[PDB]
Design a protein that fits this description.
The structure is a homodimer. Chain A has 18 helices and two strands. Chain A is mainly α. The longest helix of chain A is centred in the C-terminal third of the chain and has 25 residues. Chain A starts with a helix and ends in a 14-residue tail after the last helix. Chains A, B: Belongs to the NhaA Na(+)/H(+) (TC 2.A.33) antiporter family.
């Protein structure tokens, strides 16, 4: 019904972006506004910064809040509460984020890219992955869909975490502290049983503002909240279940999309960089441009290597391997994980990653779509 | 029931403030954080600013949003839609904000205070005015209350406007423009019939951010929105009616209170300024310290001068003049209108206005309370 409406609207952003980006009439204002350093000083203290770094810390924070909510749900209730319903998806994604890496990473065990591999081709655009799956009538899913979504999250929410520890936390003494009192309140606040979901959010924005010098952390704050916001319907109704529902549209329609309008506008012109000019390029491109469609050859080795005692779940047999193909469209999710990898550090090869995780993305969005149309 | 709970909680802020303010142990951190200039520069542009100026633009903006909502309601539906139900309250407040002035103003037709009079003793703490009225069982009101609230708003929302025109609008070309497109969207947005009240707010924050160089304007934005947010229950339900209801608690419990914690902390110590040291002082104090309890001697001349063809409304006769006494507690509302008057302009005599509109306030909060306890 409306589940597909998003895919169409979302894909519109990415395009609108390119247009804006290479337009020449807009390529100016666009790139201009986005970035832009600048210094300041409030009394006897000075500093500087740029743009875009806000928009993403804001957007992925909200986005991951919802992700936080859902992962809790699936963990405490549905699709993953039991170490029996979990075992597959976990084993399915714990693979889903080690083959892509250990393909791309081992494709680039060189230098300022070693950090790139570690992730980029891990995240799957959980928004697009279910989008292309919805354009398919309605037969086969309803247990297939609720499955895919276990990877995307685990793999995405995974990366974000692996990456939070990998980084030498800019433990700004103070902040790291505030983050603690705030993160503490969140707890006592849930303990004493507060369901006024308004509160939780504000504390969160505090926590968010605290850890605001490291993107991946501000992102994680979202998750941290979506984790504390009450779930047990004890009240008579669930505050989380409500929130997760009002947020759903907004993220899929405003956020996700909006976020894609800021990051997907990759400039190809200037240096049109013909065919092989892309693939040819070191892993940074081919590596992650393949770590994705060749990132399926993981479930079909990790999800299949589950001929030991782990049930499919009223699935559709070998029709699961077509799912692992769609988890090859890290689209925005990667684009994000890509900015995390570079963005502030050597960011000129970021316009490459974007291309790579855009080509490899589309060239796995249909090379995995059609295959799953003839199945029924 | 809970209508009084606020009064008790609110009054707690004002006190907590003083304590903090004159504490010596906190009087430091307090005054310190609040204020604080600071310069900046994003590229080739530099500037500076201070604190507190944010908190109030944020708080009174939200507060006046709700006020906006209600005034629309009463105007388009209840207590004031008809030029028959209006006539009294209007005539009651149009007086309620011209006698206080023309008492205080004519008490101070001197110099950098001429601007002060024009308002300060006009606003009535519509939150406190109904608070002291609720501590009184439940007999007599239910038509008296719904009346008082017509002044407070008209008088308050009045001042804010009179003051927006009186000021030589810092028509920052650009901003003044954005404010227009935004304020325009708000319209087409209501025209095409959008009830997704989420939108309206965001546009608002844009509009708010636009006119952000003149407090009184950012404040007005709130009102401007609460004005466009759809009212007709055509939908089946009203988006405004809902909003106005979720906001109610928050403003009366978090906002209003919070706002009072930032502005009511008047320092009396240092210069304890004995008795007459206060009253004695030019109008700035006595003038507005009296323009308030002697601001009743207005209805009882303007609301009573309504022996021409304007009905009371199932009221309680001379028991209306006790209402006009409570509209002598501009408390926070004045404190706010006081910061507007001074705050950025000659602000050392602002700690006076605070005192004056605090004394005259309490000395009209009981000298008007008791009188209305023996009535029943």
């Amino acid at each position: 019904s409306s589940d597909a409406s998003g895919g169409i609207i979302l894909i519109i952003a990415a395009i609108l972006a390119m247009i804006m980006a290479n337009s020449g009439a807009t390529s100016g204002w666009y790139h201009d506004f986005l970035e832009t350093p600048v210094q300041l000083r409030v009394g006897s203290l000075e500093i500087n910064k740029n743009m875009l770094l806000w928009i993403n810390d804001a957007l992925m924070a909200v986005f991951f809040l919802l992700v936080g909510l859902e992962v809790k749900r699936e963990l405490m209730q549905g699709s993953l509460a039991s170490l029996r319903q979990a075992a597959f998806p976990v084993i399915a994604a714990i693979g889903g984020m080690i083959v892509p890496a250990l393909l791309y990473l081992a494709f680039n065990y060189a230098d300022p890219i070693t950090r790139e591999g570690w992730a980029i081709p891990a995240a799957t655009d959980i928004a697009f992955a279910l989008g292309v799956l919805a354009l398919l009538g309605s037969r086969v899913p309803l247990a297939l869909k609720i499955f895919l979504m276990a990877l995307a999250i685990i793999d995405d929410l995974g990366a974000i975490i692996i990456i939070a520890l990998f980084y030498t936390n800019d433990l700004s003494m103070a902040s790291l502290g505030v983050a603690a009192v705030a993160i503490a309140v969140l707890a006592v606040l849930n303990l004493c049983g507060a369901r006024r979901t308004g509160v939780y959010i504000l504390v969160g924005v505090v926590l968010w503002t605290a850890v605001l010098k490291s993107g991946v952390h501000a992102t994680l704050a979202g998750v941290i909240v979506g984790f504390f916001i009450p779930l047990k319907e004890k009240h008579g109704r669930s505050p989380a279940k409500r929130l997760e529902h009002v947020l759903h549209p907004w993220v899929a329609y405003l956020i996700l999309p909006l976020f894609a309008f800021a990051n997907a506008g990759v400039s190809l012109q200037g240096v049109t960089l013909d065919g092989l000019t892309s693939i040819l390029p070191l892993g940074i491109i081919a590596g992650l441009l393949i770590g994705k469609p060749l990132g399926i050859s993981l479930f079909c080795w990790l999800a299949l290597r589950l001929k030991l005692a782990h049930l499919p779940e009223g699935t559709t047999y070998q029709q699961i391997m077509v799912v692992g193909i769609l988890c090859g469209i890290g689209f925005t999710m990667s684009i994000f994980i890509a900015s995390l990898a570079f963005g502030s550090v050597d960011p000129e090869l970021i316009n490459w990653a974007k291309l790579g995780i855009l080509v490899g993305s589309i060239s796995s969005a249909v090379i995995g779509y059609s295959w799953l149309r003839v199945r029924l």
